[PDB]
């Protein structure tokens, strides 16, 4: 029946050609257009296209659009199956109803039964008020699903419009949150209530805009320039991820050599210890085709988390940034890396940790802020992780931080060190003042006591005599050392004690 074709095409129109323009007006693509660019050209199969809500209050039953506000279904990304839902803002604001969620659950339930990621494209005005508790229940079934799938199948959230109220809590629980620079936002409570209750006046963009979230709240993993790159970068991300927790990181061709040498590296660590360098240089040189997909770049900049491949396989990476806060570990840097580590482990992605941390960032602000708990998270993450763990200390590895950064005591596999490494209880100075009290009144004793601690302990060799550093290597060969180190761990299998789940600090 060409009648079918009509119904079909009718549905495809969403809230109508006038609203479609409105949407495009805000620089925002439509639900379907976003889906169209996300999935392998012509590979999308839509489900529940003619679903209509079951509301009867407030004359809601006189406006029963097809699809009920969200476009769901599946398709492929580079040939690999992926499940998706794109909220159609032009339809009843892409407001969440009993049936809108049901649609999302159908493909979440399908993603899980078949072991395939779920990409969520949120662009909604929020709950569908007229539905009452049914809107609440609608959220509930999504949340529950979101939770059960955590670490079982990758859940990438894409915010491309508004996201308010309970809603935020869903992407909150997914593995990644990407936002579109200016057209998107998200917050539990609206700017207007923030006023009537805080008397504070703030705009939606200020309150929960892409920027606010990619660098202040710690909620988004990146803010993309616009809808098109947003979609493009997400597939890029998906190309690294495994399809579920059973299989291991995907493999693909790679035009680079596992034995590549970067001599430039031999001088990356500056002579003067007070001069930074960009830890990211190292990352790119080690990374396969120099490709490095960074996560939460604009947040907790004193630490770097990202993905790279080696010999065409996915490797996660956590590394300290001297350029910021002197590579200190702090509540935020900790929370930022901690989760990255956990996601990579939950999904069999190995870890490469590049080290140069002085210690943790001092301060009343830190202590009152609970570094005792947040700081531990990253420690907890490496302690728990069982994927293959290779480490390279480029320079500073002092005290507690030293331990947290994938130390050998956290049962990492390879603990490499550049000759410029310095692993020790604390700096030569402080160390000395504690070890030699009755000697401070002799500024030449302590000037000499330090000079000895420095000459005897600030290096990687005392740690080597102990076995804590499996080897000290020539910087230029890092790429070669690390590549085969992982290669040899492809079979690694380690068992953690049985338990329903962990109790990591929150």
């Amino acid at each position: 029946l060409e009648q079918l074709e009509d119904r079909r095409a009718a549905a495809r129109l969403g809230g109508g050609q006038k609203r479609i323009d409105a949407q495009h007006g805000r620089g925002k693509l439509t639900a379907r257009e976003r889906v169209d660019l996300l999935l392998d050209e012509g590979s999308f199969e839509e489900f529940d296209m003619f679903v209509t809500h079951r509301c009867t209050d407030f004359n809601m039953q006189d406006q029963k659009p097809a699809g009920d506000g969200v476009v769901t279904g599946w398709g492929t990304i580079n040939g690999r199956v992926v499940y998706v839902f794109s909220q159609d803002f032009t339809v009843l604001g892409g407001s969440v109803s009993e049936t809108h969620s049901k649609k999302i659950c159908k493909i979440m339930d399908m993603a899980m039964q078949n072991g395939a990621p779920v990409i969520g494209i949120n662009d909604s005005g929020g709950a569908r008020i007229q539905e009452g508790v049914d809107s609440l229940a609608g959220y509930g079934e999504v949340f529950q699903r979101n939770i059960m799938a955590s670490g079982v199948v990758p859940q990438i959230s894409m915010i491309m419009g508004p996201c308010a109220g309970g809603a935020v809590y869903s992407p909150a629980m997914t593995d990644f949150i990407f936002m579109v620079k200016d057209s998107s936002y998200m917050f539990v409570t609206g700017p207007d209530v923030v006023k009537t209750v805080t008397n504070e006046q703030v705009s939606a963009e200020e309150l929960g805009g892409a920027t606010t979230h990619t660098r202040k709240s710690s909620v988004a993993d990146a803010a993309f320039e616009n809808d098109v790159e947003a979609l493009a970068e997400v597939r890029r991300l998906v190309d690294f991820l495994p399809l579920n927790n059973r299989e291991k990181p995907p493999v693909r061709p790679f035009f680079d050599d596992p034995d590549r040498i970067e001599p430039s590296l031999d001088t990356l660590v500056p002579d003067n210890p007070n001069t930074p360098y960009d830890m990211k240089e190292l990352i790119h040189k080690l990374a396969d085709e120099g490709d490095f997909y960074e996560i939460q770049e604009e947040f907790a900049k004193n630490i770097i988390t990202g993905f790279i491949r080696l010999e065409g396989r996915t490797v996660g990476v956590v590394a300290n940034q001297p350029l910021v806060l002197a590579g200190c570990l702090d509540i935020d840097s900790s929370r930022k890396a901690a989760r990255f580590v956990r996601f990579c482990d939950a999904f069999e992605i190995p870890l490469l940790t590049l080290i140069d941390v002085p210690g943790f960032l001092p301060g009343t602000s830190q202590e009152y802020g609970g570094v005792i708990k947040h700081g531990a998270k990253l420690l907890y993450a490496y302690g728990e992780a069982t994927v293959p763990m290779v480490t390279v200390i480029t320079r500073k590895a002092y005290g507690g931080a030293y331990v947290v950064m994938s130390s050998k005591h956290l049962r990492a596999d390879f603990n490499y060190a550049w000759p410029t490494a310095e692993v020790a209880v604390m700096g030569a100075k402080g160390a000395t003042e504690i070890i030699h009290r009755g000697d401070l009144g002799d500024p030449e004793k302590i000037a000499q006591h330090t000079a000895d601690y420095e000459e005897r302990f600030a290096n990687p060799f005392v740690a080597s005599e102990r076995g804590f550093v499996d080897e000290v290597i020539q910087p230029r060969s890092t790429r070669k050392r690390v590549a085969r180190a992982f290669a040899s761990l492809r079979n690694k299998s380690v068992q953690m004690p049985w338990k329903k789940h962990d109790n990591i600090p929150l």
Binding site: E41, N78, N226, P250, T267, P276, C328
Partner: protein
């Protein structure tokens, strides 16, 4: 002939060293602190410290030098240039030892050292002089004598193309002056030579005009940076002859012999950023990849992994080429540059490429104001002509597919439902769209455009290569590649543009995307880290480039460099060394 020290460093040091040892001669060098790395150090058969990074404490200090010259046993020290190559004090201290300062006699040096004196010494020497000029062309002559009365010239080099008086491009011979006027300048050049008792090799700078009327500005008693050009057409090693003669010796060839074959062009790779008013650039060299072989010569004092310190000349390399015809050399050069890869610092590579493509450079019709006339607003960037955008479009399109196909070979794909790569694309270049179709087999790829035209792309390239050597329509196209969301960043000549390679619907929708507008900047530099101000390297009323180092706060035994947000001028400063500021404290203010 044996243990000969070098009073210089950088590229020049290597320049000489590479010659000394090529004639079995015990090489020796010196080096400051921030120069233990330097390529010359490792090129010599010995090396001695000489103090801190500043040369007014290491390379100029005659005590230091000397102590080492004996410390390693002299025999013939060389000053290279621009240092003690022309400072009498050192010139005598050497004779006060027997160390043959290879070059000119401390007398003739002070001779042409003073304008007045020089003026006269050329007069009776019957040396032309601006009496008392139309198209001023800076054309110089390379002459070499010996302390045995003999002396000859080896052609002329035109360095008309110089910015702010700093030479940029030198060539040999000169596209202007002909045979007669050449020997004219040449015969008179060398004549002037003897007249002052010049020994080694030296240069005589003239100011030819519109009628081939040549005059004489001055003589530089030393080896010229731009000599390579002379060498690539004469078939001589000024550094060789330089020592030979500095070592009581005759000239193996006479004037009738000194022949000048084919052409030679020399560019200077300076660590300066054309895009930001040639502001010097400071930093480490991440990628540093020059060409190699129509000849290709690269004199460098740097390597990859090395750093360009504030304590010296921003020159990173001299990229010389040569061939039969001039048009030829300008070409090897143009290709040469295309493959020169530099990362980590700001440089003039694109600028050089630009002038090499500049018609006036091509026609040779250039004056000494050329730089000032043609680039009045600094380097405004370069932008490709249709047939260029076209060739590039096709290449990117061709490369993009290659990469895209690879994404397709991911493990774990639906058995009979893999992703199938498209044939239709839309390459968006310099504000220009190119709907294109691709068809490729095994040899290469065939890109066809709307107008029925089709180019054939052939290439070695593969993802990750930072440089791409393609063959589009049988003609060589060398590109510098970088990844970008919808395609790549391509750089060809002075070119440097985002080439988007999207599919028709991808392109169709991207067209709906808003046009990004940069953020706003406060004219107030707030201190972001509660630290101590280590140093301010900017003065009140100074002009700053976008991203220029302003001050430096010490965080937790770690230095952080703060830098200008956008180009602007310092209104006022309100903090100095030793100061300790909290967050937000205004460090400086801009007008």
């Amino acid at each position: 002939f044996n243990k000969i020290l070098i009073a210089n460093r950088g590229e020049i040091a290597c320049r000489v060293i590479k010659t000394a040892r090529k004639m079995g001669i015990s090489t020796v060098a010196i080096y400051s602190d921030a120069d233990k790395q330097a390529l010359h150090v490792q090129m010599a058969d010995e090396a001695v410290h000489i103090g801190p990074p500043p040369a007014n404490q290491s390379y100029i200090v005659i005590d230091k030098v000397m102590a080492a010259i004996r410390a390693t046993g002299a025999q013939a020290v060389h000053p290279g240039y621009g240092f003690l190559s022309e400072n009498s004090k050192f010139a005598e201290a050497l004779e006060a030892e027997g160390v043959i300062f290879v070059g000119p006699p401390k007398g003739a040096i002070e001779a042409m050292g003073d304008k007045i004196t020089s003026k006269k010494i050329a007069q009776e020497a019957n040396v032309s002089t601006v009496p008392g000029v139309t198209q001023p062309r800076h054309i110089e002559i390379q002459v070499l004598c010996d302390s045995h009365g003999n002396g000859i010239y080896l052609g002329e080099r035109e360095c008309s193309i110089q910015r702010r008086n700093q030479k940029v491009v030198e060539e040999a011979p000169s596209p202007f002056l002909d045979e007669a006027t050449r020997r004219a300048m040449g015969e008179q050049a060398v004549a002037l030579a003897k007249a002052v008792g010049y020994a080694s090799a030296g240069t005589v700078e003239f100011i030819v005009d519109g009628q081939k009327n040549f005059y004489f500005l001055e003589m530089n008693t030393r080896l010229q940076v731009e000599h390579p050009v002379t060498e690539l057409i004469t078939g001589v090693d000024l550094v060789e002859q330089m020592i030979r003669v500095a070592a009581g010796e005759p000239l193996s060839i006479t004037q009738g012999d000194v022949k000048l074959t084919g052409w030679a062009i020399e560019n200077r790779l300076y660590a300066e950023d054309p895009y930001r008013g040639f502001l010097p650039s400071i930093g480490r060299l991440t990628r540093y990849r020059p060409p190699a072989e129509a000849a290709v010569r690269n004199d460098t004092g740097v390597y990859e992994g090395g750093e360009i310190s504030m304590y010296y000349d921003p020159m990173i390399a001299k990229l010389c080429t040569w061939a039969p015809t001039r048009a030829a050399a300008i070409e090897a050069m143009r290709i040469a540059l295309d493959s020169f890869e530099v990362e980590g610092i700001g440089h003039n590579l694109p600028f050089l490429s630009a002038v090499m493509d500049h018609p006036k450079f091509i026609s040779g019709d250039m004056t000494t104001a050329f730089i000032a006339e043609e680039y009045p607003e600094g380097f405004e960037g370069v932008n490709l002509p249709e047939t260029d955008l076209r060739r590039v479009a096709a290449a990117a399109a061709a490369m993009h597919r290659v990469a895209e196909i690879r994404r397709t070979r991911v493990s774990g794909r639906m058995d009979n439902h893999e992703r199938r790569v498209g044939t239709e694309w839309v390459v968006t270049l310099q504000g220009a769209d190119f709907p294109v179709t691709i068809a490729a087999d095994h040899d290469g790829s065939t890109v066809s455009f709307d107008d029925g035209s089709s180019m054939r792309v052939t290439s070695d390239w593969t993802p990750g290569d930072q440089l791409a050597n393609l063959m589009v329509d049988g003609a060589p196209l060398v590109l510098k590649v970088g990844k970008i969301s919808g395609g790549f960043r391509i750089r060809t000549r002075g070119a440097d543009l985002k080439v988007h390679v999207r599919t028709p619907r991808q392109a169709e929708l991207a067209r709906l995307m808003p046009e990004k507008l940069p953020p706003d900047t406060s004219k107030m530099l707030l201190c972001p880290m509660p630290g101590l101000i280590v140093k301010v390297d900017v003065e009140v009323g100074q002009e700053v480039q976008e991203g220029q180092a302003l001050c430096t706060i010490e965080a937790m035994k770690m230095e952080n460099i703060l830098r200008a947000e956008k180009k602007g001028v310092v209104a006022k400063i309100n903090a100095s060394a030793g100061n300790s500021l909290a967050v937000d404290d205004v460090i400086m203010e801009f007008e």
